[PDB]
Structures are given as structure tokens and as C-alpha cells.
Write a protein that binds this DNA or RNA. Structure first.
Ligand SMILES: [K+]
Ligand SMILES: [K+]
Ligand SMILES: [K+]
Ligand SMILES: [K+]
Ligand SMILES: [Mg+2]
Ligand SMILES: [Mg+2]
Ligand SMILES: [Mg+2]
Ligand SMILES: [Mg+2]
Ligand SMILES: [Mg+2]
Ligand SMILES: [Mg+2]
Ligand SMILES: [Mg+2]
Ligand SMILES: [Mg+2]
Ligand SMILES: [Mg+2]
Ligand SMILES: [Mg+2]
Ligand SMILES: [Mg+2]
Ligand SMILES: [Mg+2]
Ligand SMILES: [Mg+2]
Ligand SMILES: [Mg+2]
Ligand SMILES: [Mg+2]
Ligand SMILES: [Mg+2]
Ligand SMILES: [Mg+2]
Ligand SMILES: [Mg+2]
Ligand SMILES: [Mg+2]
Ligand SMILES: [Mg+2]
Ligand SMILES: [Mg+2]
Ligand SMILES: [Mg+2]
Ligand SMILES: [Mg+2]
Ligand SMILES: [Mg+2]
Ligand SMILES: [Mg+2]
Ligand SMILES: [Mg+2]
Ligand SMILES: [Mg+2]
Ligand SMILES: [Mg+2]
Ligand SMILES: [Mg+2]
Ligand SMILES: [Mg+2]
Ligand SMILES: [Mg+2]
Ligand code: NA
Ligand code: NA
Ligand code: NA
Ligand SMILES: [Zn+2]
Lengths: 104, 49, 127, 57, 149, 113
RNA sequence: UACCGUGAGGGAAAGGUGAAAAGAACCUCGAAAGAGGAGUGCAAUAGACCCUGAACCCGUCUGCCUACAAGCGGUAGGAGCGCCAGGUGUGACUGCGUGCCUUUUGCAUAAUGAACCUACGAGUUACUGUUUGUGGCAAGGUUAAUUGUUA
RNA sequence: AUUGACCGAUGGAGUGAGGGCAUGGGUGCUAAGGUCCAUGUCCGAGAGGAGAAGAAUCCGGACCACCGGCUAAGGUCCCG
RNA sequence: AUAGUAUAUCGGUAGGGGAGCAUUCCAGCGACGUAGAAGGGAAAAGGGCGACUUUUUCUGGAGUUUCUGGAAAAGC
């Protein structure tokens, strides 16, 4: 089976043992568990359950792997030609690595 | 104790340095505006004028 | 402290398997010399000697005598006279050497610079 | 009259596509076995077309 | 650090590329060509990828019976230039029909296609015939009612 | 004392010239040409990060349009039926379902049709 | 000093082998220039223009791409192929995109400016005021020239 | 009612070549991408979207990231 | 920025204000180096953000440097 669930404002396909990268979760340590009860569609080999608001009974439980994973560095450049204005900053996005255990 | 000297907070300050690039906010025209008498080297105010 | 001695020992052991000859500071322009190097690149040595001997370019006579040296270096490092049809030019390159600057007068008192260029030539041979 | 711009490396090298040294037209001498230019007298032996032409001392 | 859920692009080894035969027996020229262009582009494929050739090869038959409305056959002026001074020339849709259907359809379908290298390739996937007779039975062309599009 | 930052001044140039590898001609290695080209490229990237979200939503909608039309429904009517029924599946998920799992997409259509 | 000027006069560039010359006997190819060896030496890719040895600029080789294709040359996507377990080189095809500086009401501007690289290059110091951040002493605060002791 | 937007003292400035549009006018020919004033506004010093491509017309004020969603002006045959 | 995490705010030329990095040398407490310093080539990784920093390996063959404070021939 696979499911679509809204984890941290993002809808993802989830299967048992996937190691998904999601937006950074605050106040977690490696090995902690997290629940996600926002299943929109369930597709277990032939029969589809479409959630109107939600599937209402489906959820996924994940084991946190890495509390803090940093995305690649992106250079943010602003410039207005012939005016002298110029600035350059660096950005890294923050993620959390989770391993899906059960698709209950 | 010559290895750990410290002055009082807010007692020393760095000096202004102009004409050294855009990021400082003091480069290019170096706080002088664009043209006219006041922008030139050697301008001084005529006190009574 | 023996580091540069150990770096240099490996450099010398590899040179025993490389057969080559060099021409340094030839007083002619590198671009014209390159025209000759493209002609004999990757060509059997016996055929290249005749090609260089009857070439209409003046740079060929210098190169012909350097190929003869490269073959002789091969036989010294291999301990036998080379066969016929055996060796060939496996590598050749021309590099610009140091320039001699001169003056040539021009009208109305002006003077221009003349460059008298030089080049280096290196040839490798292989069986 | 004047170049508006310097030529790039690519443009200069593209023009030089047709700058080639001409190879000699060589033949082997049936007498000497040496290379000589076709339709000329062999400078080594002096022969030409099977006959002696320049008896060299 | 990376993207887990990602959108997949079709490539040369994953596209469908079917053969279809359509019928121009009584269709308006520009309205039928607007649909043929969608077919060649792959706008009807759920795996549509804009940088790859994913559409269907199209065969048009009975193209000599296309219909143009109004006073368009000898009222619509085309313009072109030879490149010589005083070199502008005029021609009409009927002037193309004399050459053949494949010379009017190709011009009309072109101009409804992307103006790039990919569009130049996919116009070659169109084959236009006057009569009902063609030779592609080795490709097993499928039948499609253009009115169903 | 006399202060000249030879090594530091030259290191700033060398770091940027690693970023201009792969450019055409003098734009890859000549300092004032290359730095000009690199700075212009950074302005494109800020604008193109935004346009990425526009281009990918347009591609999701096009694929959804083709899949819906194979089931007798246009994109505008299918979307109107989903929003009427409270279904909150986003366009990225639906397009993926349209392309790679056509049987699940057909169940969403059969729920609102 | 060289060099320039009739003359008064003007006026450069140019440091570094190695601890020690031990500064390369002798052989090979060459008419000999040059090299390949040998030998000295910690090191000769320290070989005389010799410590280190960057850029612009110039070659050879290897990998990928390129002869139906049209614009500031990148940027965001994206197959295939080649190397070393998901990193790296390349980039078929697609979207968007008229350099930079200065001066201007306003510049892709056919307004100014630069061949390129390396190096050089432009708000500094003294004194006298004034405002302010931080301190000492406080109805008082502070010495100037100079003098004594020591060194 | 109002994120506080006003004033005094005192340290530091820049500016004193403006421009388009709408409205009320003078001048001009009820000409000018003209010129001179007044009231707003925008460009100047402002990116994004529509208008094929346009400094100031229409929508809209960019802290950074996102392969999420709703809309504005304007649109929904194809290029799009 | 205000209140002590909450509310607001964060497009910018002339121009005003705040906080930092690198460079040369000095004082102090201390470290590193022929078992390989500085410099030069390559690669990898870091930083509320950045000016920049760190590590590995090749070359190189003798000097170099952390922190706190101080002074400028202090950045194209
Ligand atoms: K070198
Ligand atoms: K081609
Ligand atoms: K001019
Ligand atoms: K030093
Ligand atoms: Mg400013
Ligand atoms: Mg400037
Ligand atoms: Mg100026
Ligand atoms: Mg002025
Ligand atoms: Mg002024
Ligand atoms: Mg003066
Ligand atoms: Mg010469
Ligand atoms: Mg000759
Ligand atoms: Mg004369
Ligand atoms: Mg030529
Ligand atoms: Mg060395
Ligand atoms: Mg040296
Ligand atoms: Mg063609
Ligand atoms: Mg003007
Ligand atoms: Mg101005
Ligand atoms: Mg413009
Ligand atoms: Mg031009
Ligand atoms: Mg001027
Ligand atoms: Mg010029
Ligand atoms: Mg110009
Ligand atoms: Mg320049
Ligand atoms: Mg210059
Ligand atoms: Mg005035
Ligand atoms: Mg005025
Ligand atoms: Mg006017
Ligand atoms: Mg008027
Ligand atoms: Mg005027
Ligand atoms: Mg404004
Ligand atoms: Mg804002
Ligand atoms: Mg701001
Ligand atoms: Mg300086
Ligand atoms: Na300025
Ligand atoms: Na080493
Ligand atoms: Na410099
Ligand atoms: Zn003969």
C-alpha cells in the first residue's frame, strides 16, 4: 500500500520504510516517534479510499532519524544596475529525516 | 594581567572610514553628494559668507 | 630531510621507459614550426624522414635532425638497433620560447617593435 | 578600416583551418631504394627512368 | 536536504507515440488544424513533457475536401519576400491547393506549433493525403474521430 | 607599519573563478569579464527560483487536463467538482497519480462524476 | 651612470644556484646548436636568464558535445554517454533573459569609459574649538614651561 | 478610532537641472513627447502581473526558502 | 523594535545610524615547525548572514601563529 498524507504542510507519498526528508520539526531527538493523522488518500492494491476531509482512521508512525539536516547553500543576490546597491547573502533550508515504520 | 585587559563598555569606538566599497554604505561619492563646490577637494566654508 | 630525494627517485625510474629528444631555443617562429609538426604526427619514422627531407618548409631541416636523435635515444635505452617499419612518432609538440625585441623605424619619427620569436620542440617515438 | 573588436580565440582558430603545409609527392627509387620526388632525378644515385642521368663522382 | 516527492519527465525510452488516422472530409481548415496541432504536441498524453517529442504521428485523409468559409479561398492574401529589392509577392489559399493539400495543411499547422528546434522536428510527424489511399499498413494506424476531440 | 594584503586580495579572485568554470571564451577565466558574467547570473537565479513554482504548476495542470479528458471531463469541470466535494488533494499529487497510477486517478474522478 | 638636449638642464632599468663549484670527466645523435645518458650533490623539474615559480597568453593528450542551425552567452529544468556508489565530467531538447560603469527627467542606447592580466593608485596628520560615549575628582577641577632622584 | 504616525533641545546630512498622467487654468493655434502655475498621484529612489515589445496606462509595494493553496488586472481554439 | 516567548515591522538613490571580517606590526599569557613553516596547485566541509574560516593531499624547503588588548603605509 501507499498513502498521501500532509506531514508539515507538504503532501507526500508514504510507504513502509522510506526515509523521507520533511520540514524541520522542533523539539525532537533521534529515535523519538511522531504521528501523522492527515491521510488524504489510501491505495492498498486496487481499492482507493478518498478522504473528503480526511480518510478518518488512517495514520502513519515514523521514527525520527536526524533532527536537523541542512539543505544545500543558496546565494541570494540583489542588485540595481547604475545605482550602487548590491547585497549577497547565503541561505540553507532546514529539514528533518524520518523513517516510516508502520502505515497503520 | 597584561594578557586580559579590557576597557569599560562603550568607552572605545571604531573610526569612520569612507570610500571603501558599497557594503559599508560610505563608498563612491563618499558622503559628499554629487557635484558643486562642496564636493571638491579643498572646499572650506567661508565663515561669514 | 630525504623527502625531495624520494620524490626524485620515482621521477627518474619512469624516465627510463620514455624515449624522446628535445630542441630548445630554436630561433624561429613557433606558429610556422607547428605547421611542420602537424604533418608528421603519428607517422612511421622511416616515412617521416623522407617527408621532412623533401619538404618545402625551412623549419623541416631542423626537425629532421631532431627525429634522428630521438631514434638514437630509443636504441640507447633499449640496447638494439631499431628495425624498419617498427618505430613511429607517437607525440610531438611545439611551445613558444622567449622573444627578442627589436626596433623598426616608421614615418614621421615613430618607432615600432619587432618580435623575433623562438620555440621548443619535443618528439617522442614508440614501437 | 579598423577592427571594431578583437577576435576571440575561436574565430581566429576557425580561419586557420586552411593553413596546411603541403606534403611532397614522394616515390621510391627502383635503383637506390631511396625516397625521391616523383618525376625528378634521384639525387643519391643520379638515375632517372631506369637510365643514368647525372653521373656523380 | 533533497527532494523526496518529485515529478517525473518522460524521455525517448518512455513515450507512447501512437499512429492515428483522422478525416478532413467536411471540416473547417483552421479548426481542424488547431486540433491536429494538439495531437502532434502530446497535449492528450498524461505523461506530456514539453522538452521531448511525445505526441502522436498523424495521418490526414480526404484533405482535398477541407472547407474554408467566407470569401477566404481567394480573399485571404499571404505575403512573402524574395530578398531582392521590390521582391514582395502575394498568394492565396487556393494557390496552395493547386500544388496539393500537403502544401496548405503544412503551412497552416505550422504557426500553431512552437517556434523552436522541437517544433521543426514534430512537423515531420504529419502526413497529409488527397484521396483515401495511403501506404502505412505496416505501422497499423489507429482510427480516431476528430469530432471526439 | 606598511600593510599590503597580497595573499588575501588574490584569494578573493581565485574563489570566484572556480564558480565561473564552464563559461564560453573569456567569460570563464578573465577576471573583470568573468566577475561581470557571474554577477549577472546570480540575478537570473533569484528570478528563476520564483518562476520554477509557476512552471511546475502549469505542468501539473496540463497533465491533469489530459487524464481527465480520457474520462469525459475537462480540467475546469473536474476541479470544480473536487472543490465542491471538499477534496483537498493538491495538483502535484493528482498529476503524479494521473501519470504513474492511472487507476487511483480514476477513483477520484468516479467519486465526483 | 647609460640615454636625451646646442646649452642651462632632464634622467632610468637592473638583488637571490648551492652548505660547499663539488659549475657536469666520459659516451650517443648531430658539420657543430641542442638534447639523451653518465657523474657531483639532500635536491639538477637547484645546470648558469639557476630559491619559490601565480595570472593573462600558448601547446599536446584523454572524456563528453558539435556540419537544418540565428541575439549580452547565462540561469532554471532535463535524457543519454564516460569515469569513481551516489558522487563527478559533458550537455540532446525546453522556459526565461537587450553587459557593466558614469551622467541623467529619462540610457540596450547609435551618450562617457576600458585590449587583457599581474603589480601601483585617491578623506591623512598636526594644532585650536564644539557635541557626544566612558572615566577621575568634586564647590572645586587642572597644571604649563621647568626642577629633583634613579636609570 | 489610529503600531504610535506630532513637537522642543542638540550632533550629522543631502537637495535647491525634475518628469509623466488626471483635474482647474494662463500662454500657444482649444498645436506640440510645448511652456508657466495650482491640487493629487506615480517615476525619480520601485522589482512582480496584463498590455507583442513602452520610466510614470491597468493590477500590485519584493526579509529568505518551498516541485503547497486562494485570488487581482486580464483571460480560457493553437503558438500560450 | 517594543512588552517581557507575544504584537508590529523588514523595496530603496543622495544621505544619517548600528554591528562585524580580513591585512601589517606591538604588549601579555601561550603554542607549531626538517617526523616539514610561509607561499603555490587540487579537493572537501563550515558560517543567524556575509566580509571569511577550517581540514586533507601534491609542490616547497624555513619560518609561522591562537586569544585579550594596542597602532595603522589597513581592502580596487
Ligand atoms: K610554470
Ligand atoms: K544536426
Ligand atoms: K559623442
Ligand atoms: K612574516
Ligand atoms: Mg546610501
Ligand atoms: Mg561606483
Ligand atoms: Mg561623479
Ligand atoms: Mg546638479
Ligand atoms: Mg551639493
Ligand atoms: Mg586641485
Ligand atoms: Mg629568428
Ligand atoms: Mg627549402
Ligand atoms: Mg627623421
Ligand atoms: Mg588562410
Ligand atoms: Mg620542483
Ligand atoms: Mg626557479
Ligand atoms: Mg528546415
Ligand atoms: Mg539630455
Ligand atoms: Mg537624480
Ligand atoms: Mg530601457
Ligand atoms: Mg551596438
Ligand atoms: Mg562628457
Ligand atoms: Mg573606447
Ligand atoms: Mg558603451
Ligand atoms: Mg575594466
Ligand atoms: Mg585598467
Ligand atoms: Mg540654483
Ligand atoms: Mg530650479
Ligand atoms: Mg514637458
Ligand atoms: Mg497647457
Ligand atoms: Mg522643458
Ligand atoms: Mg514610489
Ligand atoms: Mg515589504
Ligand atoms: Mg531596507
Ligand atoms: Mg592602501
Ligand atoms: Na555613495
Ligand atoms: Na609534504
Ligand atoms: Na590589486
Ligand atoms: Zn635512386
Amino acid at each position: 500500500m501507499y498513502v498521501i498524507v500532509d506531514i508539515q504542510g507538504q503532501q507526500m507519498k508514504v510507504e513502509q520504510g522510506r526515509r523521507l526528508f520533511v520540514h524541520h520539526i522542533k523539539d525532537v531527538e533521534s529515535g523519538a516517534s511522531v504521528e501523522f493523522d492527515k491521510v488524504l488518500l489510501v491505495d492498498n492494491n486496487g481499492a482507493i479510499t478518498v478522504g473528503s476531509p480526511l480518510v478518518e482512521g488512517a495514520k502513519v508512525v515514523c521514527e525520527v532519524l536526524t533532527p536537523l539536516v541542512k539543505g544545500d547553500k543558496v546565494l541570494i543576490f540583489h542588485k540595481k544596475r547604475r545605482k550602487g546597491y548590491r547585497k549577497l547573502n547565503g541561505h540553507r533550508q532546514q529539514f528533518t529525516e524520518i523513517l516510516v515504520k508502520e502505515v497503520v | 594581567n597584561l594578557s586580559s585587559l579590557k576597557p569599560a563598555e562603550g568607552a572605545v569606538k571604531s573610526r569612520k572610514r569612507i570610500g571603501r566599497g558599497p557594503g559599508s554604505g560610505l563608498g563612491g561619492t563618499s558622503t559628499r553628494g554629487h557635484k558643486g563646490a562642496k564636493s571638491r577637494s579643498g572646499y572650506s566654508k567661508k565663515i561669514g559668507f | 630531510g630525504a623527502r625531495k630525494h624520494n620524490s626524485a627517485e620515482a621521477r627518474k625510474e619512469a624516465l627510463k621507459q620514455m624515449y624522446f629528444a628535445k630542441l630548445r631555443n630554436v630561433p624561429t617562429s613557433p606558429r610556422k614550426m607547428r605547421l611542420v609538426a602537424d604533418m608528421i604526427r603519428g607517422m612511421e619514422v622511416n616515412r617521416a624522414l623522407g617527408v621532412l627531407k623533401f619538404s618545402n618548409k625551412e623549419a623541416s631541416a631542423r626537425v629532421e635532425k631532431l627525429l634522428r636523435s630521438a631514434v638514437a635515444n630509443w636504441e640507447e635505452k633499449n640496447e638494439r638497433k631499431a628495425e624498419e617499419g617498427e618505430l613511429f612518432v607517437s607525440r610531438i609538440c611545439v611551445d613558444g620560447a622567449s622573444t627578442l625585441k627589436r626596433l623598426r623605424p616608421a614615418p614621421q619619427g615613430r618607432g615600432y617593435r619587432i618580435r623575433k620569436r623562438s620555440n621548443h620542440v619535443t618528439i617522442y617515438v614508440d614501437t | 578600416a579598423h577592427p571594431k573588436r578583437r577576435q576571440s580565440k575561436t574565430r581566429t582558430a576557425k580561419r586557420r583551418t586552411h593553413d596546411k603545409a603541403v606534403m611532397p609527392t614522394l616515390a621510391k627509387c627502383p635503383n637506390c631504394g631511396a625516397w625521391h620526388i616523383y618525376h625528378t632525378v634521384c639525387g643519391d644515385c643520379g638515375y632517372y627512368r631506369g637510365k643514368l642521368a647525372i653521373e656523380k663522382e | 536536504d533533497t527532494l523526496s516527492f518529485k515529478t517525473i519527465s518522460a524521455n525517448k525510452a518512455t513515450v507512447t507515440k501512437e499512429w492515428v488516422i483522422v478525416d478532413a472530409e467536411g471540416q473547417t481548415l483552421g479548426r481542424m488544424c488547431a486540433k491536429v496541432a494538439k495531437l502532434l504536441r502530446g497535449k492528450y498524453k498524461p505523461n506530456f513533457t514539453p522538452h521531448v517529442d511525445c505526441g502522436d504521428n498523424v495521418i490526414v485523409i480526404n484533405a482535398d475536401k477541407i472547407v474554408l468559409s467566407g470569401n477566404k479561398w481567394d480573399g485571404r492574401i499571404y505575403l512573402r519576400h524574395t530578398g531582392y529589392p521590390g521582391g514582395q509577392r502575394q498568394f492565396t489559399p487556393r494557390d496552395f491547393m493547386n500544388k496539393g493539400p500537403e502544401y496548405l495543411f503544412r503551412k497552416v499547422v505550422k504557426g500553431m506549433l512552437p517556434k523552436n528546434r522541437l517544433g521543426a522536428k514534430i512537423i515531420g510527424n504529419l502526413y497529409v493525403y488527397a484521396g483515401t489511399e495511403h501506404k502505412h499498413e505496416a505501422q497499423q494506424p489507429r482510427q480516431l474521430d476528430i469530432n471526439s476531440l | 607599519p606598511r600593510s599590503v594584503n597580497h595573499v588575501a586580495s588574490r584569494a578573493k579572485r581565485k574563489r570566484i573563478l572556480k564558480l565561473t568554470r564552464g563559461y564560453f571564451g573569456a567569460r570563464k577565466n578573465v577576471w573583470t569579464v568573468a566577475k561581470n558574467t557571474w554577477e549577472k547570473g546570480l540575478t537570473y537565479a533569484y528570478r528563476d527560483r520564483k518562476s520554477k513554482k509557476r512552471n511546475f504548476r502549469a505542468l501539473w495542470i496540463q497533465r491533469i487536463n489530459a487524464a481527465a479528458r480520457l474520462e469525459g471531463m475537462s480540467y475546469s469541470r473536474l476541479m470544480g467538482a473536487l472543490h465542491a466535494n471538499g477534496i483537498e488533494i493538491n495538483r502535484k499529487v493528482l498529476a503524479d497519480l494521473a501519470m504513474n497510477h492511472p487507476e487511483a486517478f480514476r477513483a477520484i474522478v468516479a467519486k465526483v462524476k
